[PDB]
Write an enzyme that holds these catalytic residues in place. Structure first.
Site, PDB file in Angstrom:
ATOM      1  N   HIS A 145     -11.502 -13.438   2.607  1.00 39.92           N
ATOM      2  CA  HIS A 145     -12.863 -12.860   2.719  1.00 39.92           C
ATOM      3  C   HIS A 145     -14.382 -13.893   1.989  1.00 39.92           C
ATOM      4  O   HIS A 145     -15.059 -13.007   2.237  1.00 39.92           O
ATOM      5  CB  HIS A 145     -13.054 -12.035   1.847  1.00 39.92           C
ATOM      6  CG  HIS A 145     -11.669 -10.736   2.449  1.00 39.92           C
ATOM      7  ND1 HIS A 145     -10.923  -9.419   2.159  1.00 39.92           N
ATOM      8  CD2 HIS A 145     -11.404 -11.228   3.494  1.00 39.92           C
ATOM      9  CE1 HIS A 145     -10.185  -9.316   2.651  1.00 39.92           C
ATOM     10  NE2 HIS A 145      -9.984 -10.342   3.738  1.00 39.92           N
ATOM     11  N   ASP A 185      -1.240 -12.220   1.716  1.00 42.56           N
ATOM     12  CA  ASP A 185      -2.079 -11.518   2.802  1.00 42.56           C
ATOM     13  C   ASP A 185      -2.212 -12.409   3.804  1.00 42.56           C
ATOM     14  O   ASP A 185      -3.090 -12.553   4.511  1.00 42.56           O
ATOM     15  CB  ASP A 185      -3.038 -11.285   1.973  1.00 42.56           C
ATOM     16  CG  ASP A 185      -3.775  -9.713   2.927  1.00 42.56           C
ATOM     17  OD1 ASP A 185      -3.661  -9.412   3.879  1.00 42.56           O
ATOM     18  OD2 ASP A 185      -5.245  -9.191   2.493  1.00 42.56           O
ATOM     19  N   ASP A 234      -6.387 -13.551   8.679  1.00 38.38           N
ATOM     20  CA  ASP A 234      -5.569 -13.939   7.972  1.00 38.38           C
ATOM     21  C   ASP A 234      -4.201 -14.937   8.480  1.00 38.38           C
ATOM     22  O   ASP A 234      -3.070 -14.111   8.088  1.00 38.38           O
ATOM     23  CB  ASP A 234      -4.899 -12.396   7.985  1.00 38.38           C
ATOM     24  CG  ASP A 234      -5.711 -11.271   6.467  1.00 38.38           C
ATOM     25  OD1 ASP A 234      -6.861 -11.443   6.374  1.00 38.38           O
ATOM     26  OD2 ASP A 234      -5.336  -9.932   6.507  1.00 38.38           O
ATOM     27  N   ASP A 247     -11.766 -11.679   9.884  1.00 34.58           N
ATOM     28  CA  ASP A 247     -11.264 -11.829   9.265  1.00 34.58           C
ATOM     29  C   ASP A 247      -9.067 -12.918   9.838  1.00 34.58           C
ATOM     30  O   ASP A 247      -9.247 -10.873  10.814  1.00 34.58           O
ATOM     31  CB  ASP A 247     -10.409 -10.664   7.976  1.00 34.58           C
ATOM     32  CG  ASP A 247      -9.423 -10.241   7.202  1.00 34.58           C
ATOM     33  OD1 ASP A 247      -9.616 -11.794   6.767  1.00 34.58           O
ATOM     34  OD2 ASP A 247      -9.017  -9.563   7.188  1.00 34.58           O
ATOM     35  N   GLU A 281      -9.797 -13.283  -1.943  1.00 34.17           N
ATOM     36  CA  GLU A 281      -9.599 -13.482  -0.800  1.00 34.17           C
ATOM     37  C   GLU A 281      -9.625 -14.348  -0.046  1.00 34.17           C
ATOM     38  O   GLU A 281     -11.444 -14.233   0.145  1.00 34.17           O
ATOM     39  CB  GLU A 281      -8.636 -12.356   0.022  1.00 34.17           C
ATOM     40  CG  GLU A 281      -7.905 -12.631   1.118  1.00 34.17           C
ATOM     41  CD  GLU A 281      -7.619 -11.773   2.087  1.00 34.17           C
ATOM     42  OE1 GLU A 281      -7.499 -10.628   1.843  1.00 34.17           O
ATOM     43  OE2 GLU A 281      -7.651 -11.705   2.800  1.00 34.17           O
ATOM     44  N   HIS A 341       1.041  -1.036  -0.148  1.00 39.04           N
ATOM     45  CA  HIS A 341      -0.086   0.110   0.130  1.00 39.04           C
ATOM     46  C   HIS A 341       1.066   1.351   0.311  1.00 39.04           C
ATOM     47  O   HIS A 341       2.148   1.108   0.831  1.00 39.04           O
ATOM     48  CB  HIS A 341      -1.045   0.469   1.309  1.00 39.04           C
ATOM     49  CG  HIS A 341      -2.041  -1.026   1.478  1.00 39.04           C
ATOM     50  ND1 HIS A 341      -1.096  -2.616   1.741  1.00 39.04           N
ATOM     51  CD2 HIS A 341      -3.213  -1.483   0.978  1.00 39.04           C
ATOM     52  CE1 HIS A 341      -2.508  -2.769   2.149  1.00 39.04           C
ATOM     53  NE2 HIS A 341      -3.755  -2.258   1.777  1.00 39.04           N
ATOM     54  N   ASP A 394       1.952   1.887   3.100  1.00 42.74           N
ATOM     55  CA  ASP A 394       3.301   1.164   3.998  1.00 42.74           C
ATOM     56  C   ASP A 394       4.578   1.191   4.226  1.00 42.74           C
ATOM     57  O   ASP A 394       5.042   1.043   4.909  1.00 42.74           O
ATOM     58  CB  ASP A 394       2.537  -0.711   3.424  1.00 42.74           C
ATOM     59  CG  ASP A 394       1.384  -1.103   3.303  1.00 42.74           C
ATOM     60  OD1 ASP A 394       0.608  -1.299   4.656  1.00 42.74           O
ATOM     61  OD2 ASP A 394       0.912  -2.354   3.024  1.00 42.74           O
TER      62      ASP A 394
HETATM   63 CO   LIG Z   1      -6.639  -9.096   0.969  1.00 44.13          CO
HETATM   64 CO   LIG Z   2      -8.346 -10.505   5.090  1.00 43.97          CO
END
Ligand SMILES: [Co+2]
Ligand SMILES: [Co+2]
Ligand SMILES: [Co+2]
Ligand SMILES: [Co+2]
Ligand SMILES: [Co+2]
Ligand SMILES: [Co+2]
Ligand SMILES: [Co+2]
Ligand SMILES: [Co+2]
Lengths: 437, 437, 437, 437
Positions: free
Chosen positions: A270, A338, A308, A306, A267, A100, A103
């Site tokens: 998600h 991710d 991850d 989420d 993802e 990003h 980031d």
């Molecule tokens: Co993502």
């Molecule tokens: Co996520």
């Protein structure tokens, strides 16, 4: 080297190796159908989770031990991360990374200052890119962390925030092009609502479409050729996120005539958060020509947020890679991790252990999926299953010759309809034979 | 009368009445803005749950006590139900009812026999319709109960089932037209999959679109003017139902160029099963011009299956009716009670008690929603909230004058972005003032 | 033979066999630590799903093709099922089977008639048992299907239903003892509530405890020595089932002083329905000394109802068998396949394919779990992880020497607390090495 | 005054008031059965959400505008909060407040420093308490935010963390006693696990019990007479929290012989997160004599994380207060608003608007619940419903005279079992009559 002195370059050692710092299944060098495993998979490191996440959660403070933790000046920290990032890319042997804009460099008190900081770091990353084998898979703009985005970015009720959002994305497209990114992602973290009582849904969706439209116009203008991707998520932090799932996104893109410019970044976590299997979402995107790239991770289906996590379920990675192979493999997309280490996995080397776990799981799944496709295991059955459409009334149906009147004539004349088993249990046991071959 | 001798015609008695067999909030005769409460709400009785459901569930047998239970011949039972249905319509004072072709008459050994039985019953219903005040809101075809539909109807891998499905829907459109139905509904109960391993998703979706297309062609041909409606549900009995939610349906209709013919029938329990609030689904359909009709019920958000309970949450009925009033009220749609009495509510009069509960809850919600709209309680706040788009940079954004370059020029020059509170808590407490006014 | 002529006895053929009618991983004859695979696993066939389920679901009719379908008299059907059952046991090579009293014989118009029918069939099963290698693992009473159980069995508001329930269980205990069952199960399908508005929760729980207490008294009296088991499920058909999960059951048993007589029968699908991983529920039961037996199946974590699918996830069967091996293996319990073929898998041989899939998945998981335990892979790490309790202040804590005052003295004097990584990602990748060894 | 100059003391103005800064339903002064509304409800302000939360979420930074935001020194901020807190207590007219030790003062580099800071602030709060009408409802220790608690507090694999946890709770009990707290709460935020692979579940549960046991010993020693309360939550931040729900807690307390010292603090959002209705959890605690106190809030049943919203659903507050009235009202517990303003409600006065919304919703619910209990609306039906246990065989069952043999004798002799309707729909519509009376 400087930041991860205790870890040497990770190399393939096979399934019987006891060395925790080695690949057990992922052999970058292995060749399958004229391409190395490395070019089939296109693994990518997520800059945000890997170099900026600190173990903080909603109930507690940072746990992560990081060598660049001692710097106090924001720019010193940003520079140290770039160094550490490239040391890491080299040791984990990653062909790609994603980031990003926010980031890689800290914001200033004005947009001008923010953009100057960004230019400094971008210039630095560019030098490293000249001597690194790692490239940028995709870039994106963080339009959700800063307080200004409380009410949304392009869906904000505040026109000034829309203006700012446009400015940030303009800059982000520019630096992505400059670093040679192959895609550009849009994740609408704050593009949704918290309560319908204060929301003009049509107005917000109109503005969201205007914004996306301005973004494609600008990309053409500067000649950015990377694929635009929307990343679906049903909720969190919002109560309802507009890009709920792949179908929601397609409904939106088709209505506002944006569908020829976008594909989706799916993802796993998600997808399951929207109550779709990862594979369903991959398949649906595929048949609609919009499977663009993948964020390789997993959630926990018993946890409604989420997580991850690094993906370690090889049955799931197989079913996922089956879809990617069926579309002919990646084009510009790849497998972006991710994923973040658990709050309890706070030692530096856990970064390596997490990625090895995920890379091995996907490499193994790819190899199995590949045999499933090559042997046409499921395809043979599907052919036999739908064979009635190859001739007779079925052929008339698919060719456009049949209609309600002719079909009724046919149906009144048939007395017995005989169906055959779907064989789900058999199909699942064959999957196991291949998995454990 | 004959079937419900213990129950007399249900009449409005006000909120202080102790009589269980009376309306407490629903006054059919009350006039609001030139229309009676009865014509605002357009209540409809579901023929299937009301006259054919018997308390059977997946773990147990029938519990329902019904006066027409003693008949052994299928046609005698079908005729007795029509009598009982019209006695019921009269006593509950319902302006409408909905049915599946297979609710009203039994199948025979061939389609011809099935259609002859259907003609007999349709002829009978037509006589009753001549002297009843109740009309048909919508008709539909049951394409999910019979074993032939195991693999789907139009999405069946067996072309013969596609042919049969076309024949059944052709007949169903014909009888709906003949009984004067104002809409026709499609609920794809078996139109989805159980496992992706044996499913050709693109082929099934193509066939589903062909089928729907043949249906609109045939409707035009016979001059059926009722609104076509698709009814979304995310799953059950399937693992994934294609018409997952309103957005999924719109994505589908737009892709296959069917969107100008269909609107949606939204069911509360089906919306929450997809993890959308009933109101979200109503709002989304509204702004897309596809809010066609409503199946008035509720599920239990802690139970992951379709419960089809009578709606008694007046906060929810208010938020639902708010959406209907905002679009200008019903056109051809209405409030169809796709709800059934609990397995433990097995006495005949429970049918009355269930409907009274739901009709009162919706009548009360309508009256509150109506004051919320008339006083512009939420609309005033929404106007003030998005006011920055009325002039300045916001006006340029909505009018198509702004682009990334001009917005960046603007954004670099602004130093402070000031947002204002969303006031969710305040908005919710005002809702309570109106609810309990 | 008579009912499954197309299927011969299923034999082990190894992972490379193309023969669908053979075991790929389950070798009944394989010896591990002095016991054959068959005696480690103790596979059991569920009589209800295997010989009485017909594909009916809540939206459709029967799809199952069964050779005993042609009989019209209820007793002829019951006798044909016993024949078919024993042919099946022989061909699938099952050491055990489980049944409900109401699975094996039809009810009559009175309890006396019902019991006479039951005696006839029990006598018949007893003859077959004399020449079959298959034995009865556990028996149980169906206290949920018959309409009389609408309001519950022992938790019914109707004392007559409590009396009937006692009579049925008395009979069921008697026939289980007579057939040599090793356990007896209680699944409270209707023991819960649908609404709190009409429920006296304390009274129902008191009665439930009285009932269970009368059952243990009667078992002692007739000298039935099998293990009593409660089977948890959070809901369905009820809104809340009292035996919600293992912890709920333990809270109940301890309060009413019944905990010394009962263990639990844990079903995978029922654990995940309560939002616990199957392994969590197994582990929790283990450390509480109540892991009695297992219903081997899987649900779908995206579907909120009991699917009872055959288990094919070998990562899950491994984690499950890890728990069973850790407690020293089964005692009187076993792996009962409370699973049914999908509605689309309606051909007779699918019964075989379903069981082969599940037996292979559990056999493979057992073999991997066994290596995980033997190599002490997770145990070594756990030992090192909690080592601080082996001496110093930790030893004082476990031995009962420390208290708040002494611990405070200690804590004020320490300045740095240093934790170490939990290594979750590493642990998960090692699991994969073992899975795919 | 100093911190909320724009807000004057909130007063009751009735349901027709347009003044947003006033109570619409909550009249502190209203007398019902010899007690004011204020003493029936015992409203409490949560110090953590109200004075320390800043709008930060997992995807973004602080949004909250707070007058004490300008201080840089941690102790200056802590002192400013105490001032602001007491100004707030006075204006919102709250009789109680709750706090965590770590909410009121900042930690130092050692436990000694931490305790000195705590003493300074406690001394200050004590002065304000001398002139304020607000008292401390309960205190608690934050054993989850600091990094040292990564692996748990008493369930930590690190004995030093157990020692520290004991020291912190010792101090927290001391200051709670000194400030006159009426209860003391234990919320095990980190007392659970993230993965079973590295967890010794029995050891952790043993240690958890040792810890709790040391806490009751110490309370006796210093003569602290407040009620000990455990607060259940199923998960978050952990994957599984040991105090999963009320039943889990009771199973635990009974096993380790701690049940005579603890009651539960039930939070609405935590109950629904475990898939229990708030009312179920309240009822279950009641009949077990452990309903100690309540955290008054709501979650969103479509969102799988703790939202801690202000409660505005008056149907739910009614059903909740029904349970509290049935047990005879609060003893030492109360209604603590463990709720926070939405991230978008960031202006100071939103703190007032949030609390007014929740206080009004609970006041209204109390008044309705009170009429439901007084008129014995549900109780009459329950009496009639279970009447068969008042004589005949039912009386024999409850008195301990009946057993399996006698009940069988009875059951063989009865031919028809007749049940009656559960009347759920009727019961729900009566609830509406009372709600909208
Ligand atoms: Co993502
Ligand atoms: Co996520
Ligand atoms: Co429904
Ligand atoms: Co419906
Ligand atoms: Co089950
Ligand atoms: Co079971
Ligand atoms: Co909470
Ligand atoms: Co709380």
């Amino acid at each position: 080297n400087k930041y991860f002195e205790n870890v040497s370059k990770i190399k393939y050692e096979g399934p019987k190796s006891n060395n925790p710092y080695s690949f057990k299944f992922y052999n970058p060098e292995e060749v399958i159908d004229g391409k190395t495993m490395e070019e089939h998979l296109r693994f990518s490191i997520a800059y945000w989770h890997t170099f900026t996440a600190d173990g903080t959660d909603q109930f507690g403070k940072a746990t992560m031990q990081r060598p660049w933790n001692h710097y106090t000046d924001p720019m010193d920290i940003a520079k140290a991360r770039v160094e550490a990032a490239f040391e890491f890319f080299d040791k984990i042997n990653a062909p790609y990374f994603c980031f990003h804009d926010r980031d890689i460099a800290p914001e200033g008190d004005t947009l001008r200052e923010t953009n100057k900081n960004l230019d400094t770091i971008v210039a630095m990353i560019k030098d490293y890119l000249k001597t690194s084998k790692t490239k940028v898979l995709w870039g994106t703009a963080n339009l959700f962390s800063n307080p200004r985005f409380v009410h949304g970015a392009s869906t904000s009720c505040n026109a000034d925030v829309f203006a700012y959002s446009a400015a940030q994305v303009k800059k982000a497209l520019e630096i992505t092009k400059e670093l040679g990114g192959e895609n550009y992602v849009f994740w609408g973290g704050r593009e949704g609502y918290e309560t319908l009582l204060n929301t003009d849904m049509e107005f917000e969706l109109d503005n969201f479409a205007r914004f996306l439209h301005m973004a494609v116009d600008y990309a053409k203008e500067i000649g950015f050729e990377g694929q635009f991707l929307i990343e679906p998520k049903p909720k969190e932090p919002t109560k309802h996120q507009y890009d709920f799932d792949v179908a929601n996104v397609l409904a939106f893109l088709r209505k506002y005539d944006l569908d020829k410019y976008f594909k989706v970044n799916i993802e796993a976590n998600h997808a399951t958060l929207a109550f779709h299997d990862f594979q369903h979402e991959l398949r649906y995107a595929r048949i609609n020509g919009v499977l663009g790239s993948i964020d390789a991770n997993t959630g926990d289906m018993l946890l409604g947020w989420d997580t991850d996590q690094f993906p370690t379920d090889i049955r799931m990675t197989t079913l996922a890679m089956y879809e990617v192979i069926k579309m002919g493999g990646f084009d510009k997309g790849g497998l972006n991790f991710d994923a973040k280490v658990r709050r309890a996995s706070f030692e530096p080397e856990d970064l390596f252990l997490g990625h090895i776990a995920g890379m091995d799981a996907f490499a193994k799944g790819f190899k199995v999926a590949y045999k499933l496709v090559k042997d046409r295991v499921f395809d043979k059955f599907i052919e036999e299953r739908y064979a009635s459409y190859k001739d007779g009334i079925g052929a008339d149906i698919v060719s456009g010759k049949a209609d309600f009147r002719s079909l009724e004539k046919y149906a009144l004349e048939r007395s017995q309809i005989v169906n055959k088993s779907g064989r789900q249990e058999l199909l699942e046991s064959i999957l196991n034979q291949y998995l454990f071959a």
